[PDB]
Amino acid sequence: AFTVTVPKDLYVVEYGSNMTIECKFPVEKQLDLAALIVYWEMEDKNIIQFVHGEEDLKVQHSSYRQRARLLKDQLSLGNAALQITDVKLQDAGVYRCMISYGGADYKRITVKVNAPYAAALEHHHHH
């Protein structure tokens, strides 16, 4: 059948870095935007709604605005790559990508946002 896969189902990233999480799906030769729909959620918030070559900026939850986008040219490889920049703590949680391109499937991805070593350091100087 149609099948979405994830190269990795757990990302661990540092507060304030940029992250790119990935979903793969089968594309042959050339992509057909007419047939393609890509969604990204995490928890109870809408990240990406890519329907027929157009990404409706209005459906995006406000905390992801100007800060999370879908990598377009990656799509022609069957890679729906979500890129969040300057990650916050409230970006940790269970993400999910849903893809329709002929068939339809989804997969889940866990993302954790930990503090930098220097923050653990300050906190050990209270020890």
Partner: peptide, 17 residues
Amino acid sequence: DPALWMCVFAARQCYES
């Protein structure tokens, strides 16, 4: 599937405003 996903996305977008 994608119809359901668009429904839920619509529902949450409404709530958020």
